[PDB]
């Protein structure tokens, strides 16, 4: 199984590697629309990048539900195929 610290680090790397994102203000408990200022389409792009890195497939409903870093880490850590 993959450690939660490594999950956090990889998710933070995915979020930080974004054009409209300031890398300084990225924390495991930030919200895409509120803190670092992204719209819905940037959220789903980030979710797709997380899928591509972690080798996992999320149903569309849960992919929409993923709207913040904390949710992303929680889902990826709960998934056993990470």
């Amino acid at each position: 199984h993959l450690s939660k610290e490594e999950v956090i680090q990889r998710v933070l790397a995915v979020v930080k590697d974004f054009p409209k994102v300031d890398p300084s203000k990225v924390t495991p408990d930030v919200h895409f629309q509120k803190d670092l200022g992204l719209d819905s389409l940037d959220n789903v792009e980030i979710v797709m990048a997380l899928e591509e890195e972690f080798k996992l497939e999320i149903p569309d409903k849960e992919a929409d539900k993923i709207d913040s870093c904390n949710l992303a880490i929680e889902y990826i850590a709960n998934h056993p195929m990470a």
């Binding site: 080798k55 996992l56 497939e57 195929m81």
Partner: protein
């Protein structure tokens, strides 16, 4: 919102027309090549011994 809904419907139809015939699926994902290959045993299953006997 009404023209938004019609735009959504038209976009959905266009996507259904031009979608890939065999889109990529993760092997263990539902519909992949490894789906339900060697699943873990279900929980709450009991095997009963001495089922049929002449006397109890």
């Amino acid at each position: 919102p009404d023209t938004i809904d019609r735009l959504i419907a038209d976009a959905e139809a266009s996507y259904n027309k031009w979608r890939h015939p065999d889109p990529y699926i993760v092997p263990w994902a539902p519909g992949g090549s490894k789906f339900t290959r060697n699943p873990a045993p279900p929980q709450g299953i009991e095997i009963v011994y001495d089922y049929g006997r002449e006397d109890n």
